[PDB]
Amino acid sequence: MACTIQKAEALDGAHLMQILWYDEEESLYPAVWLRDNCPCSDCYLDSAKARKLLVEALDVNIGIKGLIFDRKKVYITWPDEHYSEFQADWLKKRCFSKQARAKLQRELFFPECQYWGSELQLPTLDFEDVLRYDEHAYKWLSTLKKVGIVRLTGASDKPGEVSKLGKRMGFLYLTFYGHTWQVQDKIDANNVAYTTGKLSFHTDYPALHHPPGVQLLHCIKQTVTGGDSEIVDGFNVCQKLKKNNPQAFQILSSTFVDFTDIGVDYCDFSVQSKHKIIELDDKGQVVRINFNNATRDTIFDVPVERVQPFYAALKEFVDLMNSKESKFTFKMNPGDVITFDNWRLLHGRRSYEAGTEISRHLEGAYADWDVVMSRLRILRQRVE
Amino acid sequence: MACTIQKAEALDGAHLMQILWYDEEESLYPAVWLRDNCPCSDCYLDSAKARKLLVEALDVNIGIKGLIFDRKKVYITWPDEHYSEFQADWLKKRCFSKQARAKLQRELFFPECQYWGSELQLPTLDFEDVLRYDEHAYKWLSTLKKVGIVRLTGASDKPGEVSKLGKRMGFLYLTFYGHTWQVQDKIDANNVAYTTGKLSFHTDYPALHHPPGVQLLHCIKQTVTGGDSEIVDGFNVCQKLKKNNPQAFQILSSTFVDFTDIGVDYCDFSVQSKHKIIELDDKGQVVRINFNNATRDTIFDVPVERVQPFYAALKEFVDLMNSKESKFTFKMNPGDVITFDNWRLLHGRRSYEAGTEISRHLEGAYADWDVVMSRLRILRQRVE
Ligand SMILES: C[C@H](CCC(=O)O)[N+](C)(C)C
Ligand SMILES: C[C@H](CCC(=O)O)[N+](C)(C)C
Ligand SMILES: O=C(O)CNC(=O)C(=O)O
Ligand SMILES: O=C(O)CNC(=O)C(=O)O
Ligand SMILES: NCCCCCCN
Ligand SMILES: NCCCCCCN
Ligand SMILES: [Zn+2]
Ligand SMILES: [Zn+2]
Ligand SMILES: [Zn+2]
Ligand SMILES: [Zn+2]
Ligand SMILES: [Zn+2]
Ligand SMILES: [Zn+2]
Ligand SMILES: [Zn+2]
Ligand SMILES: [Zn+2]
């Protein structure tokens, strides 16, 4: 009844098609959009699922010349004698009502989000299960997207596990630190990560204009002397900051901060960026946190009078992150893997003791959110 | 005289340091910024060129407790007995005046830009020279950044040339179409690029939220039956559009368009995005064009009444691109490589004739702008 056509007609000087469905609801489709999206082999390459029609071939003032229909299809003639057929279900799905458009966007982008503080129950799955079963890989990625983190247990205590998950997603994201990389204490460390020092809350790689969306960290070896992990939900903290201190929020979401990274690892590099620490979309929703205090530059491109207020804002923001209501602490063991949203979470670690042998070793990697979402879309379809 | 210290003092309740240089100019440095950027081994890890100091250790209300100086350094004591030394040249470079900050930004980001239309003289270098000499690789990347395109001649007529340039930059950008990819006519083409059809002006990969910054295309084999290349400077076209049709400009720079790509190539994929076709920074400057008509989705997430005005805007934009004053046409020969800014240029190709053997073959690859700029920074330093 809902996707069965009861009536189709051209309206509004034939610039619009209206469908009355059998459930009595109505949908409207501009004529230019219909012509633009003609599925015939002239206009549309089915093997690629892509449009061949050029913008240059589209009359933006086009009207429908003729229309007939049955319960399942509309058949249209155009002023220049082009001919088009559209299927009822295809039409129904693309209805321009706010409700139909929003529903489809949810299905494409999995916007569901569950904010958390210290009460977090760390979502946890088995590693081999995730590699083997789509049902488990689906739960893995959907929870990663919704909650921002998933732990995987039962991996080995050897290099190569993040690489297997990378393949399960599709491919990992290559950076100047390599395809994968080793978090251990190193002589002449090119990065504070590669020391025994404390890492306060940070996102990885704000020195890139497109920081890694997803981070993977696998504990190969762990020390008893320290090295606990800490996470906080950045979207949650930002919401509390806007509430408690709209001025601090305003400064952090509007000020461009310079980040830097110079050194040699996979290649030799001299990397520079600018980002707003709290990054808002066009509707004012926080979509990314860009913040690592180690790689924030000495160069600070703001007028002198904006400097101290910036720091006072940043301090309020860091204090919220450290608050006992926001922060969640745990300690990784050999064979544990954490996979998390590096645009949303900030993470850190406690200091631990140097010695003459390596007491602590994680292997990490990155992946692009688009690569991950693509796998998520495919998995959902296979599972449903 | 300009970077020699004539006087240093604490001012403004000791919250500011003022330096009077020997050229009689003055610079101001907030106390909190100085403490934040103390270069001592407690605060700063020299092997990483990174800050160890935590935000949590920074008193945002800090003042200078004592200060002494000579011609080349300032020596500061802090209220908690921490001690800091700063070098005159380091200080001079980071001066918070608008002029000093802007100068340094130019040096970091190479903003110089030369807009062009049909009068373009295609910048051209030798391929092997670029692989061999830093002077030539520097000219290559600086011109790529400034002009948006460089041709390289004298490559071979065999696969693997884009890969060599990838290494010269650092590394190539892996996508679902592979590390490198073959533009040829293919049975069951997963993409309109892999046909003999005309490609109108487009950027590559707006189906990703972070489209490739730089594209490389190497002609292995060329057909006489068609297949000429066309380019246009997108930043130039946008400027003309804002002038001629501010309404069209407003629609294109504000409307989110959905892009899609579903198929199998390097991996199986189902990719979705949203972008504004004309993408503006926070000051209203165009920083990216995101537009491929083949991969623009059938799904169009706007209210019905915005649809036709969107198309009328897009048509004005495409017509400008096609104008004889904007467009530059040329034809690639075996051994030619084009490297260009895929955020700024749009490119296309003329149709050509199918046959039973492959008459036309290019190999392409992508690179990230951050990877390229890093190499650019390193090269400049080596050459100067
Ligand atoms: C880049 C990260 C550290 C975070 C950063 O520098 O932003 N590595 C662990 C070294 C791979
Ligand atoms: C992605 C490009 C075409 C452009 C596009 O689909 O956006 N390939 C040539 C197939 C690698
Ligand atoms: O060592 C850890 O526990 C966490 N490591 C990092 O956050 C890093 O390397 O960037
Ligand atoms: O075939 C050409 O000349 C140009 N190719 C493309 O723009 C492409 O593959 O995306
Ligand atoms: N069942 C209706 C088919 C209509 C074909 C029209 C071709 N011009
Ligand atoms: N040449 C001046 C060195 C000052 C050292 C001060 C240590 N507190
Ligand atoms: Zn139906
Ligand atoms: Zn058609
Ligand atoms: Zn980290
Ligand atoms: Zn290298
Ligand atoms: Zn000097
Ligand atoms: Zn110090
Ligand atoms: Zn292309
Ligand atoms: Zn794969």
PDB file of C-alpha atoms in Angstrom, chain A residues 99-340:
ATOM      1  CA  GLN A  99      10.945  12.083   7.193  1.00  0.00           C
ATOM      2  CA  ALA A 100      11.882   9.940   4.210  1.00  0.00           C
ATOM      3  CA  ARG A 101      15.176  11.814   3.638  1.00  0.00           C
ATOM      4  CA  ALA A 102      16.185  11.593   7.322  1.00  0.00           C
ATOM      5  CA  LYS A 103      15.415   7.915   7.466  1.00  0.00           C
ATOM      6  CA  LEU A 104      17.564   7.180   4.478  1.00  0.00           C
ATOM      7  CA  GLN A 105      20.451   9.305   5.924  1.00  0.00           C
ATOM      8  CA  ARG A 106      20.332   7.242   9.118  1.00  0.00           C
ATOM      9  CA  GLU A 107      20.664   4.083   7.027  1.00  0.00           C
ATOM     10  CA  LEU A 108      23.630   5.469   5.136  1.00  0.00           C
ATOM     11  CA  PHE A 109      25.582   7.076   8.026  1.00  0.00           C
ATOM     12  CA  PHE A 110      24.692   5.263  11.284  1.00  0.00           C
ATOM     13  CA  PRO A 111      24.375   8.461  13.312  1.00  0.00           C
ATOM     14  CA  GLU A 112      23.240   6.699  16.557  1.00  0.00           C
ATOM     15  CA  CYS A 113      25.553   7.791  19.351  1.00  0.00           C
ATOM     16  CA  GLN A 114      25.784   6.808  23.014  1.00  0.00           C
ATOM     17  CA  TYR A 115      27.665   9.258  25.194  1.00  0.00           C
ATOM     18  CA  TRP A 116      29.427   7.983  28.299  1.00  0.00           C
ATOM     19  CA  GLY A 117      31.495   8.934  31.366  1.00  0.00           C
ATOM     20  CA  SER A 118      33.174   6.910  34.145  1.00  0.00           C
ATOM     21  CA  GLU A 119      30.212   4.459  34.121  1.00  0.00           C
ATOM     22  CA  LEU A 120      31.324   2.969  30.801  1.00  0.00           C
ATOM     23  CA  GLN A 121      31.003  -0.788  30.442  1.00  0.00           C
ATOM     24  CA  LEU A 122      33.754  -1.431  27.918  1.00  0.00           C
ATOM     25  CA  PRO A 123      32.159  -3.221  24.925  1.00  0.00           C
ATOM     26  CA  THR A 124      34.175  -6.409  24.414  1.00  0.00           C
ATOM     27  CA  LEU A 125      34.281  -9.112  21.735  1.00  0.00           C
ATOM     28  CA  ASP A 126      36.518 -12.053  20.834  1.00  0.00           C
ATOM     29  CA  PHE A 127      39.236 -11.335  18.238  1.00  0.00           C
ATOM     30  CA  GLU A 128      39.106 -14.574  16.251  1.00  0.00           C
ATOM     31  CA  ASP A 129      35.287 -14.471  16.240  1.00  0.00           C
ATOM     32  CA  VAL A 130      35.425 -11.012  14.671  1.00  0.00           C
ATOM     33  CA  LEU A 131      37.836 -12.236  11.970  1.00  0.00           C
ATOM     34  CA  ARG A 132      35.657 -15.259  11.274  1.00  0.00           C
ATOM     35  CA  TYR A 133      31.978 -14.268  11.592  1.00  0.00           C
ATOM     36  CA  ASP A 134      30.176 -11.386   9.893  1.00  0.00           C
ATOM     37  CA  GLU A 135      27.684 -11.269  12.752  1.00  0.00           C
ATOM     38  CA  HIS A 136      30.653 -10.502  15.076  1.00  0.00           C
ATOM     39  CA  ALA A 137      32.420  -8.078  12.703  1.00  0.00           C
ATOM     40  CA  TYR A 138      29.128  -6.269  12.330  1.00  0.00           C
ATOM     41  CA  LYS A 139      28.708  -5.947  16.074  1.00  0.00           C
ATOM     42  CA  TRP A 140      32.319  -4.811  16.248  1.00  0.00           C
ATOM     43  CA  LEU A 141      31.999  -1.910  13.748  1.00  0.00           C
ATOM     44  CA  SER A 142      28.489  -0.810  14.693  1.00  0.00           C
ATOM     45  CA  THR A 143      29.531  -0.548  18.324  1.00  0.00           C
ATOM     46  CA  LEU A 144      32.752   1.260  17.365  1.00  0.00           C
ATOM     47  CA  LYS A 145      30.608   3.829  15.501  1.00  0.00           C
ATOM     48  CA  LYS A 146      27.947   4.145  18.200  1.00  0.00           C
ATOM     49  CA  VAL A 147      30.021   4.021  21.390  1.00  0.00           C
ATOM     50  CA  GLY A 148      33.469   5.028  20.008  1.00  0.00           C
ATOM     51  CA  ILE A 149      35.351   2.032  21.291  1.00  0.00           C
ATOM     52  CA  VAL A 150      35.465  -1.741  21.337  1.00  0.00           C
ATOM     53  CA  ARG A 151      37.912  -4.042  23.019  1.00  0.00           C
ATOM     54  CA  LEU A 152      38.851  -7.311  21.349  1.00  0.00           C
ATOM     55  CA  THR A 153      40.250 -10.074  23.545  1.00  0.00           C
ATOM     56  CA  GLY A 154      41.974 -13.339  22.673  1.00  0.00           C
ATOM     57  CA  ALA A 155      44.452 -12.010  20.098  1.00  0.00           C
ATOM     58  CA  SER A 156      48.007 -13.377  20.178  1.00  0.00           C
ATOM     59  CA  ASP A 157      50.922 -11.794  21.993  1.00  0.00           C
ATOM     60  CA  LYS A 158      52.788 -11.243  18.704  1.00  0.00           C
ATOM     61  CA  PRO A 159      52.964  -8.566  15.926  1.00  0.00           C
ATOM     62  CA  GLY A 160      50.560  -8.837  13.000  1.00  0.00           C
ATOM     63  CA  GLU A 161      47.211  -8.791  14.789  1.00  0.00           C
ATOM     64  CA  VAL A 162      46.286  -5.195  13.900  1.00  0.00           C
ATOM     65  CA  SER A 163      47.146  -6.064  10.288  1.00  0.00           C
ATOM     66  CA  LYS A 164      44.512  -8.874  10.316  1.00  0.00           C
ATOM     67  CA  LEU A 165      41.845  -6.433  11.534  1.00  0.00           C
ATOM     68  CA  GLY A 166      43.042  -3.991   8.848  1.00  0.00           C
ATOM     69  CA  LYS A 167      42.296  -6.610   6.180  1.00  0.00           C
ATOM     70  CA  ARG A 168      38.973  -7.379   7.815  1.00  0.00           C
ATOM     71  CA  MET A 169      38.129  -3.689   7.405  1.00  0.00           C
ATOM     72  CA  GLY A 170      39.743  -3.411   3.983  1.00  0.00           C
ATOM     73  CA  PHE A 171      43.046  -1.620   4.375  1.00  0.00           C
ATOM     74  CA  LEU A 172      44.932   0.334   6.965  1.00  0.00           C
ATOM     75  CA  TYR A 173      45.912   3.993   6.680  1.00  0.00           C
ATOM     76  CA  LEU A 174      49.629   4.561   5.921  1.00  0.00           C
ATOM     77  CA  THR A 175      51.341   7.456   7.726  1.00  0.00           C
ATOM     78  CA  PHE A 176      54.934   8.669   8.288  1.00  0.00           C
ATOM     79  CA  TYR A 177      55.116   6.287  11.299  1.00  0.00           C
ATOM     80  CA  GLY A 178      54.512   3.276   9.022  1.00  0.00           C
ATOM     81  CA  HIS A 179      51.748   0.833   8.110  1.00  0.00           C
ATOM     82  CA  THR A 180      51.844  -0.330  11.685  1.00  0.00           C
ATOM     83  CA  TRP A 181      54.078   0.957  14.456  1.00  0.00           C
ATOM     84  CA  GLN A 182      55.604  -0.078  17.752  1.00  0.00           C
ATOM     85  CA  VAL A 183      54.799   1.822  20.978  1.00  0.00           C
ATOM     86  CA  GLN A 184      57.861   1.128  23.157  1.00  0.00           C
ATOM     87  CA  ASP A 185      60.579   3.138  24.868  1.00  0.00           C
ATOM     88  CA  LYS A 186      63.184   4.075  22.191  1.00  0.00           C
ATOM     89  CA  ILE A 187      66.630   5.667  22.326  1.00  0.00           C
ATOM     90  CA  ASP A 188      66.468   9.026  20.538  1.00  0.00           C
ATOM     91  CA  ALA A 189      62.643   8.832  20.469  1.00  0.00           C
ATOM     92  CA  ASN A 190      61.137  10.690  17.518  1.00  0.00           C
ATOM     93  CA  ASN A 191      57.853  10.993  19.499  1.00  0.00           C
ATOM     94  CA  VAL A 192      56.842  11.221  23.173  1.00  0.00           C
ATOM     95  CA  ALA A 193      54.691   8.137  22.591  1.00  0.00           C
ATOM     96  CA  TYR A 194      57.966   6.185  22.227  1.00  0.00           C
ATOM     97  CA  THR A 195      59.091   6.920  25.826  1.00  0.00           C
ATOM     98  CA  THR A 196      58.047   5.775  29.307  1.00  0.00           C
ATOM     99  CA  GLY A 197      56.449   9.203  30.065  1.00  0.00           C
ATOM    100  CA  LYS A 198      52.788   9.895  30.927  1.00  0.00           C
ATOM    101  CA  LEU A 199      50.557  10.744  27.945  1.00  0.00           C
ATOM    102  CA  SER A 200      47.797  13.093  28.970  1.00  0.00           C
ATOM    103  CA  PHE A 201      44.537  13.061  26.984  1.00  0.00           C
ATOM    104  CA  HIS A 202      45.104  13.531  23.289  1.00  0.00           C
ATOM    105  CA  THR A 203      43.903  12.551  19.832  1.00  0.00           C
ATOM    106  CA  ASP A 204      46.489  11.067  17.450  1.00  0.00           C
ATOM    107  CA  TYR A 205      47.983  12.958  14.614  1.00  0.00           C
ATOM    108  CA  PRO A 206      46.443  16.426  14.649  1.00  0.00           C
ATOM    109  CA  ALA A 207      49.644  17.378  12.761  1.00  0.00           C
ATOM    110  CA  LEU A 208      47.705  16.035   9.698  1.00  0.00           C
ATOM    111  CA  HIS A 209      44.797  18.069   8.274  1.00  0.00           C
ATOM    112  CA  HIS A 210      42.903  14.711   8.061  1.00  0.00           C
ATOM    113  CA  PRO A 211      43.708  12.918  11.291  1.00  0.00           C
ATOM    114  CA  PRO A 212      43.131   9.093  11.372  1.00  0.00           C
ATOM    115  CA  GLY A 213      39.470   8.344  12.091  1.00  0.00           C
ATOM    116  CA  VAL A 214      40.030   4.978  13.787  1.00  0.00           C
ATOM    117  CA  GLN A 215      42.932   3.775  15.827  1.00  0.00           C
ATOM    118  CA  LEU A 216      43.893   0.211  16.702  1.00  0.00           C
ATOM    119  CA  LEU A 217      46.205  -0.628  19.641  1.00  0.00           C
ATOM    120  CA  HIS A 218      47.254  -4.192  20.467  1.00  0.00           C
ATOM    121  CA  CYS A 219      49.069  -5.094  23.711  1.00  0.00           C
ATOM    122  CA  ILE A 220      51.930  -7.447  22.967  1.00  0.00           C
ATOM    123  CA  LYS A 221      53.690  -6.864  26.321  1.00  0.00           C
ATOM    124  CA  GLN A 222      52.645  -4.917  29.405  1.00  0.00           C
ATOM    125  CA  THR A 223      54.557  -3.691  32.450  1.00  0.00           C
ATOM    126  CA  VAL A 224      53.397  -3.960  36.093  1.00  0.00           C
ATOM    127  CA  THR A 225      55.128  -0.645  36.900  1.00  0.00           C
ATOM    128  CA  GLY A 226      52.459   1.647  35.337  1.00  0.00           C
ATOM    129  CA  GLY A 227      51.073   2.083  31.770  1.00  0.00           C
ATOM    130  CA  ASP A 228      47.328   1.920  32.494  1.00  0.00           C
ATOM    131  CA  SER A 229      45.104   3.295  29.748  1.00  0.00           C
ATOM    132  CA  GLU A 230      42.652   6.164  30.062  1.00  0.00           C
ATOM    133  CA  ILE A 231      39.854   7.299  27.723  1.00  0.00           C
ATOM    134  CA  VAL A 232      37.235  10.017  27.761  1.00  0.00           C
ATOM    135  CA  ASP A 233      34.294  10.681  25.381  1.00  0.00           C
ATOM    136  CA  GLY A 234      35.288  13.996  23.679  1.00  0.00           C
ATOM    137  CA  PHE A 235      31.735  14.662  22.445  1.00  0.00           C
ATOM    138  CA  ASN A 236      30.482  14.287  26.002  1.00  0.00           C
ATOM    139  CA  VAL A 237      33.152  16.612  27.413  1.00  0.00           C
ATOM    140  CA  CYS A 238      32.423  19.242  24.758  1.00  0.00           C
ATOM    141  CA  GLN A 239      28.732  19.230  25.658  1.00  0.00           C
ATOM    142  CA  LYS A 240      29.571  19.788  29.356  1.00  0.00           C
ATOM    143  CA  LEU A 241      32.063  22.545  28.413  1.00  0.00           C
ATOM    144  CA  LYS A 242      29.483  24.445  26.289  1.00  0.00           C
ATOM    145  CA  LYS A 243      27.093  24.245  29.297  1.00  0.00           C
ATOM    146  CA  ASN A 244      29.576  25.204  32.062  1.00  0.00           C
ATOM    147  CA  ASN A 245      31.722  27.624  30.081  1.00  0.00           C
ATOM    148  CA  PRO A 246      30.309  28.866  26.809  1.00  0.00           C
ATOM    149  CA  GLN A 247      33.160  31.346  26.508  1.00  0.00           C
ATOM    150  CA  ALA A 248      35.846  28.629  26.711  1.00  0.00           C
ATOM    151  CA  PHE A 249      33.789  26.589  24.232  1.00  0.00           C
ATOM    152  CA  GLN A 250      33.553  29.529  21.863  1.00  0.00           C
ATOM    153  CA  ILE A 251      37.382  30.081  21.971  1.00  0.00           C
ATOM    154  CA  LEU A 252      38.266  26.441  21.472  1.00  0.00           C
ATOM    155  CA  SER A 253      35.766  25.952  18.623  1.00  0.00           C
ATOM    156  CA  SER A 254      36.883  29.115  16.844  1.00  0.00           C
ATOM    157  CA  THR A 255      40.680  29.434  17.326  1.00  0.00           C
ATOM    158  CA  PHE A 256      43.117  27.882  14.830  1.00  0.00           C
ATOM    159  CA  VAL A 257      46.005  26.173  16.605  1.00  0.00           C
ATOM    160  CA  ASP A 258      49.174  25.184  14.783  1.00  0.00           C
ATOM    161  CA  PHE A 259      50.437  21.590  15.078  1.00  0.00           C
ATOM    162  CA  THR A 260      53.846  20.282  13.993  1.00  0.00           C
ATOM    163  CA  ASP A 261      55.845  17.095  13.569  1.00  0.00           C
ATOM    164  CA  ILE A 262      59.386  16.958  12.210  1.00  0.00           C
ATOM    165  CA  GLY A 263      61.578  13.857  12.124  1.00  0.00           C
ATOM    166  CA  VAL A 264      62.370  10.606  10.426  1.00  0.00           C
ATOM    167  CA  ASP A 265      60.544   7.329  10.612  1.00  0.00           C
ATOM    168  CA  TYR A 266      58.912   5.511   7.615  1.00  0.00           C
ATOM    169  CA  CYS A 267      60.135   8.468   5.586  1.00  0.00           C
ATOM    170  CA  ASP A 268      61.689  11.792   6.520  1.00  0.00           C
ATOM    171  CA  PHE A 269      59.017  14.377   7.316  1.00  0.00           C
ATOM    172  CA  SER A 270      58.291  17.963   8.203  1.00  0.00           C
ATOM    173  CA  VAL A 271      54.558  18.188   8.880  1.00  0.00           C
ATOM    174  CA  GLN A 272      52.533  21.287   9.738  1.00  0.00           C
ATOM    175  CA  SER A 273      48.828  21.941  10.283  1.00  0.00           C
ATOM    176  CA  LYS A 274      46.191  24.241  11.720  1.00  0.00           C
ATOM    177  CA  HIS A 275      42.939  23.053  13.410  1.00  0.00           C
ATOM    178  CA  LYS A 276      40.310  24.253  15.749  1.00  0.00           C
ATOM    179  CA  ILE A 277      40.618  21.982  18.844  1.00  0.00           C
ATOM    180  CA  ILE A 278      36.831  21.608  18.945  1.00  0.00           C
ATOM    181  CA  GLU A 279      35.728  21.257  15.354  1.00  0.00           C
ATOM    182  CA  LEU A 280      32.070  22.059  14.572  1.00  0.00           C
ATOM    183  CA  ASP A 281      29.958  21.188  11.494  1.00  0.00           C
ATOM    184  CA  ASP A 282      27.833  23.860   9.743  1.00  0.00           C
ATOM    185  CA  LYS A 283      24.986  23.285  12.215  1.00  0.00           C
ATOM    186  CA  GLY A 284      27.225  23.727  15.232  1.00  0.00           C
ATOM    187  CA  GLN A 285      27.547  20.018  16.142  1.00  0.00           C
ATOM    188  CA  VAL A 286      30.939  18.825  17.292  1.00  0.00           C
ATOM    189  CA  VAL A 287      32.309  16.387  14.713  1.00  0.00           C
ATOM    190  CA  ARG A 288      35.980  16.222  15.668  1.00  0.00           C
ATOM    191  CA  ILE A 289      38.429  16.935  18.446  1.00  0.00           C
ATOM    192  CA  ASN A 290      41.925  17.774  17.214  1.00  0.00           C
ATOM    193  CA  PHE A 291      44.319  17.890  20.187  1.00  0.00           C
ATOM    194  CA  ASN A 292      47.697  16.539  21.128  1.00  0.00           C
ATOM    195  CA  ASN A 293      49.693  18.740  23.593  1.00  0.00           C
ATOM    196  CA  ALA A 294      52.976  17.141  22.546  1.00  0.00           C
ATOM    197  CA  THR A 295      52.599  18.170  18.898  1.00  0.00           C
ATOM    198  CA  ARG A 296      50.943  21.561  19.380  1.00  0.00           C
ATOM    199  CA  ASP A 297      53.517  23.974  17.887  1.00  0.00           C
ATOM    200  CA  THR A 298      55.552  26.735  19.662  1.00  0.00           C
ATOM    201  CA  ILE A 299      54.329  28.869  16.758  1.00  0.00           C
ATOM    202  CA  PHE A 300      50.934  30.225  17.764  1.00  0.00           C
ATOM    203  CA  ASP A 301      49.267  32.295  15.097  1.00  0.00           C
ATOM    204  CA  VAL A 302      46.971  34.601  17.108  1.00  0.00           C
ATOM    205  CA  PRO A 303      47.117  38.211  18.283  1.00  0.00           C
ATOM    206  CA  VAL A 304      48.814  38.651  21.626  1.00  0.00           C
ATOM    207  CA  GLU A 305      45.655  39.534  23.504  1.00  0.00           C
ATOM    208  CA  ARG A 306      43.984  36.247  22.508  1.00  0.00           C
ATOM    209  CA  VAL A 307      46.811  34.076  23.853  1.00  0.00           C
ATOM    210  CA  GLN A 308      46.123  33.922  27.567  1.00  0.00           C
ATOM    211  CA  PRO A 309      42.346  33.523  27.158  1.00  0.00           C
ATOM    212  CA  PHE A 310      43.137  30.584  24.830  1.00  0.00           C
ATOM    213  CA  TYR A 311      45.188  28.909  27.498  1.00  0.00           C
ATOM    214  CA  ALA A 312      42.602  29.546  30.193  1.00  0.00           C
ATOM    215  CA  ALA A 313      40.004  27.852  27.896  1.00  0.00           C
ATOM    216  CA  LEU A 314      42.232  24.885  27.149  1.00  0.00           C
ATOM    217  CA  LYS A 315      42.855  24.390  30.891  1.00  0.00           C
ATOM    218  CA  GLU A 316      39.063  24.279  31.589  1.00  0.00           C
ATOM    219  CA  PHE A 317      38.713  21.742  28.796  1.00  0.00           C
ATOM    220  CA  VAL A 318      41.521  19.495  30.107  1.00  0.00           C
ATOM    221  CA  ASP A 319      40.203  19.678  33.669  1.00  0.00           C
ATOM    222  CA  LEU A 320      36.777  18.426  32.482  1.00  0.00           C
ATOM    223  CA  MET A 321      38.473  15.532  30.681  1.00  0.00           C
ATOM    224  CA  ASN A 322      40.329  14.585  33.847  1.00  0.00           C
ATOM    225  CA  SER A 323      37.214  14.758  36.035  1.00  0.00           C
ATOM    226  CA  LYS A 324      36.296  11.488  37.782  1.00  0.00           C
ATOM    227  CA  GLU A 325      32.796  11.596  36.233  1.00  0.00           C
ATOM    228  CA  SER A 326      34.208  11.645  32.620  1.00  0.00           C
ATOM    229  CA  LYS A 327      37.279   9.529  32.631  1.00  0.00           C
ATOM    230  CA  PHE A 328      37.418   5.708  32.315  1.00  0.00           C
ATOM    231  CA  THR A 329      40.591   3.845  33.243  1.00  0.00           C
ATOM    232  CA  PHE A 330      41.638   0.220  32.556  1.00  0.00           C
ATOM    233  CA  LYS A 331      44.791  -1.682  31.836  1.00  0.00           C
ATOM    234  CA  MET A 332      45.554  -3.634  28.686  1.00  0.00           C
ATOM    235  CA  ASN A 333      46.916  -7.196  28.905  1.00  0.00           C
ATOM    236  CA  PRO A 334      48.824  -9.164  26.258  1.00  0.00           C
ATOM    237  CA  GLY A 335      46.345 -10.258  23.610  1.00  0.00           C
ATOM    238  CA  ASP A 336      43.943  -7.321  24.137  1.00  0.00           C
ATOM    239  CA  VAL A 337      43.209  -4.991  21.193  1.00  0.00           C
ATOM    240  CA  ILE A 338      41.413  -1.635  21.512  1.00  0.00           C
ATOM    241  CA  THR A 339      39.804  -0.145  18.417  1.00  0.00           C
ATOM    242  CA  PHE A 340      38.362   3.323  18.812  1.00  0.00           C
TER     243      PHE A 340
END
